[PDB]
Every structure is written in structure tokens, then in C-alpha cells.
Amino acid sequence: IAKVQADEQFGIWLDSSSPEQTVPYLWSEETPATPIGQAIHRLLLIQAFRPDRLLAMAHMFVSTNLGESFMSIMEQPLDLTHIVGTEVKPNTPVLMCSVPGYDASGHVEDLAAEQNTQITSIAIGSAEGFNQADKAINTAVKSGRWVMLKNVHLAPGWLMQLEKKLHSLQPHACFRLFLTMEINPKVPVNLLRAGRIFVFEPPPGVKANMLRTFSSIPVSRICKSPNERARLYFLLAWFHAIIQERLRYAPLGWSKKYEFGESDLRSACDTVDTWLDDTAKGRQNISPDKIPWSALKTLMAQSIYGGRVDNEFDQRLLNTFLERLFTTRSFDSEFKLACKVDGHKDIQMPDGIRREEFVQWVELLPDTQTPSWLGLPNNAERVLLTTQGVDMISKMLKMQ
């Protein structure tokens, strides 16, 4: 208390953007503390003063104990080449777990493409799929080939049987079995315990979300007449990003974590296609007034995205977003996708009328996304951070 009151720069520090890098001296001790002692004292000070920075301070603590480059490997992209070549045994399945809605089979598809190793990909879920899977597994174990088994979270008992089969089996030195999942509790514990696990999460952000959306949708689909179609998709893409990223900031963003995903995006794209085809009727260009904005807004607010929404305030928020984005004003040269961004300067919608122009505008988005992009206050991130910080401590209690 005395040091807090006596210090003059305490006010500027407590309001600083990154207080963990400039924690002042507020502890009394008989003999000067070692660097790890100062690190733990600053960790306590940050936890007391600025809990939102705790995670960052936690990193510094690790950096002061295990070196500045302990976590630096994780930010680098995963290199499956060496891991599959050396670390993984032939009889150890490579479990590739993604968050629900994300896919990880492309990683090993590219891995086998660059490794020049034949791989057979099999979609699991049907009995014919099971027979194809086990015959291909036998062929690969006797011939040293790679097997992909997609969405094996759909058959838990078959996963147990596969684990039992792999335990006794003696594969060839080049055999590799990959099993892709979406992280479900149904996955057997023995299969997870007896297999290398890789967890894949999408890169958070509006930019990455919109890039994924534009990649998933074919170019020819967006290129169809009228030329306004592409712009519609852009808005839709933006809308999708704006909600999915907002799901990260629940309960402030959305009152609960809804499953807004690829299914809603496909349904909305289909709705846009059908209604724009009905309106255009073969015309190469249609006026922005002629686009059925009411139809798109209503179908997306009550059917496509609003079906999952059960709260009336979440429905109100979805309606406000749709009424803000899907209007004729979105076809102006000065339309503002997001206002009061970072408190100064606001996102402007690209002037182009082609798909490549929209993808270029997405690729040149600044890498300084804040919750103001989503309409949230900029302090929302801090709240998320502090929640995570508390969460970390709770987890650290469970490891006691």
C-alpha cells in the first residue's frame, strides 16, 4: 500500500498497454532476488493489478526459466515431414484432431505429395467404408503404403477394433496410418493413448476466416452472372467472419457459443444464388436496388443463421448485423464495413466488382484486428484475456 501510494508513475503503468514488460519494484526483501524471483514477484504483481496481462506475464516467467525460445517452435508451422519420418512408429497411428468444422487431411495429402509416397484416402462412416478401410490397411501394411481414414470420430467402436488390430499388427517400416477427427468425447481413450495426437485449430481473425471462405467457395460459382454476385458473396463472407470471430468473445460477443459453421455458409450461398438468379433472370448486370435484400436478410436471420439462435437478444444482434450489412448502401464507394475501428479510422468496403479484387482486398487487410472490427468494444479482448488467465490458474490447480 505504501509503495503504491508513494510511487508517482504507478498511474501511467497501471493504464499502460503492456504493463508486464515494465513492472515496477513494489516488494521488500532482505537480499536482492534472483531473476526467477523477480519474475515470480512480477507475476504476482500482474495478477493483482492487471490480470488480463497475466498470460503474457506467465510467458515471461517461462522465458526466464526455460529460455526465451521455449515456445518459439509452436508459432512456426507444423513440419509433419520429420515427425512422421522418424518420431512416429509404423504401428502408432497419427491422430489428427481438428476443432469441429475444421479439416486436417489436406496436411497429410500435401505431405504425401511432397514425399512421393502413395496414400489411399478413405471416408469412414459406412459399412462399405469400413470394408474399404480394412482392406486398404491390410494392403498398406503388407506393402508399406499410407492410409488416410477421414472423420473416424463417427465410428467409436470401429476405432476400438482398429486400435486392437494395430496393437498386434507388425507393420512395414514405411506404413503410416492417419486418422482425422473433430475432437469428440466419443473417441476411445485407448486409441488416443496409443497414437500420436495432433491438434489443429484455425488461425483466428477476420482476414483468415474470409480467406478460408473464399478458398472453400469455387471461383466459377462466384464468377457467375450477374457481376454483382461476387460482391454479395463478399458481404456474406464478411458477415460470416464477423460472427464466427465474435464467437470467440462469448458471452459478450454472443450470449452462448453457437455452431455457426460451414453448413450455414453453404446454405446462405445457396440462398444468394437462388434469389439472385430469380431476380436477374439472365441479365448481365442488375441495379443494387433490384437485389432482393429483404429476402436475403430475412432468410439469413430466421432460417440460415437464426435457426440456432434461441435468445431474443442474440436474434436482435443478428438482425442488426444483417440490416447493417445487406443493404443497397453496400454497393456505394464509401460504404463502411466497420465503424469506429480502434477509435479512429474505419474499414471501407473495396470498390472492385470482381472476385479477385475482393480477395486482394482481404489479403491486404492490416494484421491489427481488434474487437472494434466485430462491433465489440476494444476492451472485450482484455476480458477474454483475463478469463483465459483465470482459466490457466484453475487448470494449474487441477495439476496439483
Partner 1 sequence: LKRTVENIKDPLFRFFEREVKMGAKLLQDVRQDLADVVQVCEGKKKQTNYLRTLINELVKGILPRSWSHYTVPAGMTVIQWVSDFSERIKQLQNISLAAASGGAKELKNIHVCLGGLFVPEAYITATRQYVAQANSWSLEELCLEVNVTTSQGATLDACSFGVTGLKLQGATCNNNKLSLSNAISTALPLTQLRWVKQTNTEKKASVVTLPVYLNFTRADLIFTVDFEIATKEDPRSFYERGVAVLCTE
Partner 2 sequence: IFTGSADIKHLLPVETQRFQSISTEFLALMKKVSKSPLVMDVLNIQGVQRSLERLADLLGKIQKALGEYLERERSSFPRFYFVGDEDLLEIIGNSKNVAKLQKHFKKMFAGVSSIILNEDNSVVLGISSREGEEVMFKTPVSITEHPKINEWLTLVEKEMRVTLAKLLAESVTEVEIFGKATSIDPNTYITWIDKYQAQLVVLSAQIAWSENVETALSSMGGGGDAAPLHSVLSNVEVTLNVLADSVLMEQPPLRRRKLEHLITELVHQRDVTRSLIKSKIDNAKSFEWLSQMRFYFDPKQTDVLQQLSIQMANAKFNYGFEYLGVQDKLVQTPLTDRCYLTMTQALEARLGGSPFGPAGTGKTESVKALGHQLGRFVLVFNCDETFDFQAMGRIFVGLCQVGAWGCFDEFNRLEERMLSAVSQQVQCIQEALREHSNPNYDKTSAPITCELLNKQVKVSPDMAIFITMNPGSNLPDNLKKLFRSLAMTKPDRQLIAQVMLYSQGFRTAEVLANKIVPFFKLCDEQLSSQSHYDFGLRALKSVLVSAGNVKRERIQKIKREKEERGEAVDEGEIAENLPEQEILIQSVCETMVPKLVAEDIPLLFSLLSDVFPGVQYHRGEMTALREELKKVCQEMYLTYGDGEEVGGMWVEKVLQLYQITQINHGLMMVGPSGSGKSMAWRVLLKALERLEGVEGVAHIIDPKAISKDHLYGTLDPNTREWTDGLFTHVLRKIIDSVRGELQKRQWIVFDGDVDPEWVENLNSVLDDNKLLTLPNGERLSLPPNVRIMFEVQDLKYATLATVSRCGMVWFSEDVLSTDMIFNNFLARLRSIPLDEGEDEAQRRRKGKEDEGEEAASPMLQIQRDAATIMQPYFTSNGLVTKALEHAFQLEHIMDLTRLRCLGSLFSMLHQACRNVAQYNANHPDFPMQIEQLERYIQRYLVYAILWSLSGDSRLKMRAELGEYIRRITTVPLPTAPNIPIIDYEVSISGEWSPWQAKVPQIEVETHKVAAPDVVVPTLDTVRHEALLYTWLAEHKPLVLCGPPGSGKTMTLFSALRALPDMEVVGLNFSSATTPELLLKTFDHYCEYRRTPNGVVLAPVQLGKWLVLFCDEINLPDMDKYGTQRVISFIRQMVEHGGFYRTSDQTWVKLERIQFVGACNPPTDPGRKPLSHRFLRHVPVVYVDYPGPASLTQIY
Which positions touch partner 2 (CB under 8 A)? 125, 153-154, 182, 184, 263, 267, 270-271, 274-275, 278, 292, 294-295, 298-299, 302-303, 307-310
Cα(first)–Cα(last) distance of the chain, in Å? 31
- Interaction between residue 317 and partner 1 (CB under 8 A): yes
Beta carbon of residue 161, minimum distance to partner 2 (angstroms, whole number):
15
Q: Are 235 and 326 in contact (CB under 8 A)?
A: yes
d(CA 105, CA 347): 35
Beta carbon of residue 316, minimum distance to partner 1 (angstroms, whole number):
6
Amino acid identity for residue 384 in this structure: L
Q: Which does 299 bind (CB under 5 to 8 A by kind): partner 2, partner 1, none?
A: partner 2
d(CA 256, CA 308): 10
Q: Are 146 and 120 in contact (CB under 8 A)?
A: yes
d(CA 368, CA 242): 15
Nearer to partner 2, 125 or 144 (CB): 125
Number of residues that bind partner 1 (CB under 8 A): 25
Q: Which does 321 bind (CB under 5 to 8 A by kind): partner 1, partner 2, none?
A: partner 1
d(CA 264, CA 248): 18
- Interaction between residue 248 and partner 1 (CB under 8 A): no
Three-state SS at 354: coil
Nearer to partner 2, 278 or 356 (CB): 278
Beta carbon of residue 141, minimum distance to partner 1 (angstroms, whole number):
42
- Interaction between residue 397 and partner 1 (CB under 8 A): yes
**According to CB under 8 A, which one of 22, 316, 332, 356 is a site residue for partner 1?**
316
d(CA 20, CA 212): 34
Q: Which does 251 bind (CB under 5 to 8 A by kind): partner 1, partner 2, none?
A: partner 1
d(CA 75, CA 146): 28
d(CA 385, CA 54): 8
- Interaction between residue 81 and partner 1 (CB under 8 A): no
DSSP assignment of 240-286, as one string?
HHHHHHHHTTTTTSSSS-----HHHHHHHHHHHHHHHHHHHTT-S--
Beta carbon of residue 310, minimum distance to partner 1 (angstroms, whole number):
11
Stretch that binds partner 1, among 29-37, 116-124, 351-359, 369-377 (CB under 8 A): 369-377
**According to CB under 8 A, which one of 38, 132, 225, 255 is a site residue for partner 1?**
255
- Interaction between residue 398 and partner 1 (CB under 8 A): yes
Nearer to partner 2, 136 or 304 (CB): 304
Q: Which does 377 bind (CB under 5 to 8 A by kind): partner 1, partner 2, none?
A: partner 1
Q: Which three cell numbers stand for residue 268?
A: 446462405
- Interaction between residue 115 and partner 1 (CB under 8 A): no
- Beta-strand runs (E) in the chain: 94-98, 119-123, 146-150, 176-181, 196-200, 336-338, 347-348
Residue where the block lists cell 468444422 = 101
Q: Which does 76 bind (CB under 5 to 8 A by kind): partner 1, partner 2, none?
A: none
- Interaction between residue 378 and partner 1 (CB under 8 A): yes
**Strands of the sheet with 119-123, listed across from one edge:** 119-123, 146-150, 176-181, 94-98, 196-200
Beta carbon of residue 398, minimum distance to partner 1 (angstroms, whole number):
5
Nearer to partner 1, 302 or 387 (CB): 387
Which DSSP state fits 337? E
- Interaction between residue 243 and partner 1 (CB under 8 A): no
- Interaction between residue 392 and partner 1 (CB under 8 A): no
Q: Are 139 and 111 in contact (CB under 8 A)?
A: no
- Interaction between residue 313 and partner 1 (CB under 8 A): yes
Beta carbon of residue 3, minimum distance to partner 2 (angstroms, whole number):
51
Beta carbon of residue 376, minimum distance to partner 1 (angstroms, whole number):
6
- Interaction between residue 51 and partner 1 (CB under 8 A): no
